[PDB]
């Protein structure tokens, strides 16, 4: 038997131009990320790969294998209207 509202507004930090992986290549940020998981998320830095283009773990090759194929199309049916 309650509803309330509640609210706790935080202040503004305001950092500015940031998000570099020069001496990182293993961190997570908001603007970007120097983590290899940034791939799954999508917060990789623009210079993350440039500076971390060889930080990822071993990338095996050949494991399974699967393919697909499909193609079909057809539709025919004339008509004949009339009037009176």
From Swiss-Prot:
User: Localized where?
Assistant: Cell membrane
Where the record annotates domain SMB, the positions are: 17-56
Q: List the disulfide bonds.
A: 21-25, 21-34, 25-52, 32-34, 32-45, 38-44, 45-52
- Which superkingdom, per the lineage? Eukaryota
Entry function: May be a cytokine receptor for GPR15LG. May be a tumor suppressor; together with GPR15LG has a growth inhibitory effect on colon cancer cells which includes G1 cell cycle arrest. May play a role in breast tumorigenesis.
> What protein does this entry describe?
Sushi domain-containing protein 2
């Amino acid at each position: 038997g309650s509803s309330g509202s509640s609210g706790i507004p935080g202040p503004g930090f305001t950092a500015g131009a940031q998000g570099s992986c020069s001496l990182r290549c293993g961190a997570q940020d908001g603007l970007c990320s120097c983590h290899p998981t940034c791939s799954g998320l999508g917060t990789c830095c623009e210079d993350f790969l440039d500076y971390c283009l060889e930080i990822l773990p071993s990338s095996g090759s050949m494991m399974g294998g699967k393919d697909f194929v499909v193609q079909h199309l057809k539709w025919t049916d004339p008509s004949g209207p009339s009037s009176g």
